[PDB]
Design an enzyme around this catalytic site. Structure first.
Site, PDB file in Angstrom:
ATOM      1  N   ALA B  45       0.811  -1.214   0.000  1.00 25.05           N
ATOM      2  CA  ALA B  45       0.000   0.000   0.000  1.00 25.05           C
ATOM      3  C   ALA B  45       0.849   1.271   0.000  1.00 25.05           C
ATOM      4  O   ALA B  45       0.409   2.304  -0.513  1.00 25.05           O
ATOM      5  CB  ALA B  45      -0.938  -0.012   1.204  1.00 25.05           C
ATOM      6  N   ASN B  61       4.212  -2.951   9.025  1.00 22.02           N
ATOM      7  CA  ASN B  61       2.798  -2.918   8.697  1.00 22.02           C
ATOM      8  C   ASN B  61       2.421  -1.540   8.169  1.00 22.02           C
ATOM      9  O   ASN B  61       2.681  -0.524   8.811  1.00 22.02           O
ATOM     10  CB  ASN B  61       1.975  -3.284   9.936  1.00 22.02           C
ATOM     11  CG  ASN B  61       0.520  -3.603   9.605  1.00 22.02           C
ATOM     12  OD1 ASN B  61      -0.128  -2.906   8.822  1.00 22.02           O
ATOM     13  ND2 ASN B  61       0.019  -4.685  10.179  1.00 22.02           N
ATOM     14  N   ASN B 137      -2.972 -14.986  13.146  1.00 21.99           N
ATOM     15  CA  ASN B 137      -4.431 -15.056  12.963  1.00 21.99           C
ATOM     16  C   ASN B 137      -4.688 -15.816  11.672  1.00 21.99           C
ATOM     17  O   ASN B 137      -4.533 -15.252  10.582  1.00 21.99           O
ATOM     18  CB  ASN B 137      -5.068 -13.674  12.834  1.00 21.99           C
ATOM     19  CG  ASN B 137      -5.200 -12.951  14.138  1.00 21.99           C
ATOM     20  OD1 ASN B 137      -5.294 -13.553  15.197  1.00 21.99           O
ATOM     21  ND2 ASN B 137      -5.224 -11.634  14.061  1.00 21.99           N
ATOM     22  N   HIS B 148      -2.377 -15.604   2.505  1.00 30.15           N
ATOM     23  CA  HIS B 148      -0.953 -15.890   2.427  1.00 30.15           C
ATOM     24  C   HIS B 148      -0.424 -16.295   3.806  1.00 30.15           C
ATOM     25  O   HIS B 148      -0.854 -15.741   4.822  1.00 30.15           O
ATOM     26  CB  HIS B 148      -0.209 -14.656   1.904  1.00 30.15           C
ATOM     27  CG  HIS B 148       1.193 -14.948   1.480  1.00 30.15           C
ATOM     28  ND1 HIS B 148       1.506 -15.325   0.193  1.00 30.15           N
ATOM     29  CD2 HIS B 148       2.355 -14.959   2.169  1.00 30.15           C
ATOM     30  CE1 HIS B 148       2.808 -15.548   0.105  1.00 30.15           C
ATOM     31  NE2 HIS B 148       3.348 -15.341   1.291  1.00 30.15           N
ATOM     32  N   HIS B 150       1.320 -16.239   7.090  1.00 30.10           N
ATOM     33  CA  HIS B 150       2.085 -15.219   7.786  1.00 30.10           C
ATOM     34  C   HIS B 150       1.636 -15.058   9.230  1.00 30.10           C
ATOM     35  O   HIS B 150       0.596 -15.577   9.656  1.00 30.10           O
ATOM     36  CB  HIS B 150       1.947 -13.880   7.107  1.00 30.10           C
ATOM     37  CG  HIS B 150       0.540 -13.396   7.101  1.00 30.10           C
ATOM     38  ND1 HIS B 150      -0.406 -13.957   6.273  1.00 30.10           N
ATOM     39  CD2 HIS B 150      -0.101 -12.468   7.838  1.00 30.10           C
ATOM     40  CE1 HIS B 150      -1.564 -13.369   6.457  1.00 30.10           C
ATOM     41  NE2 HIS B 150      -1.400 -12.456   7.393  1.00 30.10           N
ATOM     42  N   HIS B 283       6.130 -20.081  26.434  1.00 33.23           N
ATOM     43  CA  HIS B 283       5.048 -20.964  25.975  1.00 33.23           C
ATOM     44  C   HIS B 283       4.257 -20.315  24.858  1.00 33.23           C
ATOM     45  O   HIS B 283       4.311 -19.104  24.662  1.00 33.23           O
ATOM     46  CB  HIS B 283       4.090 -21.341  27.100  1.00 33.23           C
ATOM     47  CG  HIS B 283       3.468 -20.162  27.778  1.00 33.23           C
ATOM     48  ND1 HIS B 283       4.158 -19.387  28.680  1.00 33.23           N
ATOM     49  CD2 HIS B 283       2.215 -19.627  27.712  1.00 33.23           C
ATOM     50  CE1 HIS B 283       3.369 -18.426  29.138  1.00 33.23           C
ATOM     51  NE2 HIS B 283       2.189 -18.539  28.554  1.00 33.23           N
TER      52      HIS B 283
END
Ligand SMILES: O=C1CCN([C@@H]2O[C@H](COP(=O)(O)O)[C@@H](O)[C@H]2O)C(=O)N1
Ligand SMILES: O=C1CCN([C@@H]2O[C@H](COP(=O)(O)O)[C@@H](O)[C@H]2O)C(=O)N1
Ligand SMILES: O=P(O)(O)O[C@H]1O[C@H](CO)[C@@H](O)[C@H](O)[C@H]1O
Ligand SMILES: O=P(O)(O)O[C@H]1O[C@H](CO)[C@@H](O)[C@H](O)[C@H]1O
Ligand SMILES: [Zn+2]
Ligand SMILES: [Zn+2]
EC number: 2.7.7.12
Lengths: 324, 330
Positions: B45, B61, B137, B148, B150, B283
């Site tokens: 972008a 990002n 996520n 994709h 990631h 963890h």
């Protein structure tokens, strides 16, 4: 409007604010409709107002054996008992609370008070909640809520008990009474005010258009609301939920529920630190179809929001109270 | 009446985050897309063109939730209105150049590359921020809009809420018992067996006693390790292997690409990295939404939002089902 974090003193949680960024009226096969058959084979009456019945697939049963005592501090389990009920708001499947009249909503409020008094005689926590919309996994569009009464104080109730008890010891006033006083002074997060109630977007809100609904008088539990307070609750809920539907011109999904002082035994107990209130947790963010996901960072670190509570409250204040 | 956890309702405690849960026991992606801004060669972008990368790829990002610079809020005039500063950086890490792969479909060396990149970014950003949160996520059901493969990394000037809860519990536990909380928890679950999912030389995966999501797992090293960069090469290879096995089991559970959110928790870094963090144990948490099929999920709504998390399937039933699933992908 710069990024920062804000504290929720009621449930002891921080949130990151990144500010810089057709249902038929009746269906004989819908087990919540008047006249319909429920899963246990019972036939619903021809009810013309609210209707309360036992959940046929309940998450809690009233009888259960207790687990043994815990043999290790990392493996702790306790008993659980309860009763789960379903409450239809109205006989028509094709209405929601904001489309209902004030007297009809008052009938809902009366039924909430009655089931709290009834189940509160046996259980220390009676949780009334509504899950509205498929987006909240609600599979039955008939207007209703659920009521789960439990022998244990649920986690969230323990958190609010702890914070409110601490606040009243430290400051001499109920947490939420001071919070109401302050938001009335500060104005910018108010959504609605009436003679007996106020609705606001909490300073620490996590969901985009989350609200908090609470009475102006110090009231520990829902049954203590006077008739005038109940009518005014019905009115102010109708206005809030109509604003919610107008925000994106759709039937606005949410989860909501009531928090009041624990019930069960009251002997030797003092609950003056409690203040009755309701939370609304709507998922929608930017349109009827664009929602907020509480995932990833929010699950592993901390709740996050882009819209500030003050922008959200400003938008809610501007919306009509006439349903679209 | 005799109690049996698979038969009778009860509540269980999460001592790591201090939370109770109700257990109601009585119940086509193309390999490459020039317009996918995470693909090799594609334009992002901000106008930058991605390199033709053949392994992992890390970038800033373009729509970050945190910026490194921000003014601090004023002091609070009231205990109910508390705000603190927030600063940080948000990065995106592609696992692999091919959009049509996921972690369980990758080779162990390729996953080891991901592990090495997790350690590098934790070291780099941890030099400047006390908390580096790596998380993935996966799946539209978790609101991921880009298929994709990631993850993301958000590093912050503040210690996030969940990290404060785990810092408090682990510190208290080691103060009272002289051992790290999750080291004793691992020892205990190895003895009790019934919630184990996978064991390897250096790692274990289990369904935690207090799990809230149906097939939730916890992944942790057998050695006491405070932060991810401290993993030895053998531990990193074995992490890659056990993650491939876990995520393949997950995909086999409902024969679909299994959605989830997951992330790493390690000792705080930043200015006080040199303090005593011996109560911490590295963890990872996995939080999958699917409940009964590829399409039927658990909704954490209503009662869960107003009172307490609730589950029907017991952690022991979930773990038994996960252990039985093949490690060969469908
Ligand atoms: O025959 C039936 C159907 C549905 N139900 C119950 O009604 C509840 C509907 O509540 P809501 O969709 O929030 C739901 O918990 C569902 O299990 C019965 O109790 N008996
Ligand atoms: O051009 C772009 C597109 C998407 N992104 C970002 O990529 C992120 C992808 O992360 P995942 O889907 O978890 C996401 O946060 C999205 O904002 C960019 O940074 N630049
Ligand atoms: O980066 P994304 O995919 O645009 O954003 C997604 O992951 C973020 C971190 O968990 C969340 O804040 C968002 O709610 C979610 O939609
Ligand atoms: O009662 P339902 O609609 O069957 O179930 C729904 O409400 C319950 C109470 O919030 C939740 O536990 C379930 O996850 C949700 O699907
Ligand atoms: Zn509350
Ligand atoms: Zn953790």
């Amino acid at each position: 409007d710069h990024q920062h974090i804000r504290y929720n003193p009621l449930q002891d949680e921080w949130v990151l604010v990144s500010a810089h960024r057709t249902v038929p009226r009746h269906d004989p096969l819908n087990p919540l409709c008047p006249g319909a058959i429920r899963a246990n084979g019972e036939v619903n009456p021809q009810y013309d107002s609210t209707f309360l019945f036992d959940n046929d697939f309940p998450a809690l049963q009233p009888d259960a054996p207790s687990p043994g005592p815990s043999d290790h501090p990392l493996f702790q389990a306790k008993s659980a008992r309860g009763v789960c009920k379903v409450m239809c708001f109205h006989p028509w499947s094709d209405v929601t609370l904001p489309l209902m009249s004030v007297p009809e909503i008052r009938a809902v409020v009366d039924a909430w008070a009655s089931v709290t008094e009834e189940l509160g005689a046996q259980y220390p926590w009676v949780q009334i909640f509504e899950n509205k919309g498929a987006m909240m996994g609600c599979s039955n569009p008939h207007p209703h809520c659920q009521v789960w009464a439990s022998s244990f104080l649920p986690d969230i109730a323990q958190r609010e008990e702890r914070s409110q008890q601490a606040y009243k010891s430290q400051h001499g006033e109920p947490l939420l009474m001071e919070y109401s006083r302050q938001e009335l002074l500060r104005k910018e997060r108010l959504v609605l005010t009436s003679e007996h109630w106020l609705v606001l977007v909490p300073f620490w809100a996590t969901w985009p258009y989350q609200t908090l609904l609470l009475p102006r008088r110090h009231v520990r539990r829902l049954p203590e609301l006077t008739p005038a307070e109940r009518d005014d609750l019905a009115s102010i809920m109708k206005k809030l939920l109509t604003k919610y539907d107008n925000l994106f011109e759709t039937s606005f999904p949410y989860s909501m529920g009531w928090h009041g002082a624990p019930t069960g035994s009251e002997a030797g107990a003092n609950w003056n630190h409690w203040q009755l209130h309701a939370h609304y947790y709507p998922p929608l963010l930017r349109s009827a179809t664009v929602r907020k996901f509480m995932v990833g960072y929010e699950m592993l670190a901390q709740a996050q929001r882009d819209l500030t509570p003050e922008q959200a409250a400003e938008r809610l204040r501007a919306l009509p109270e006439v349903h679209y």
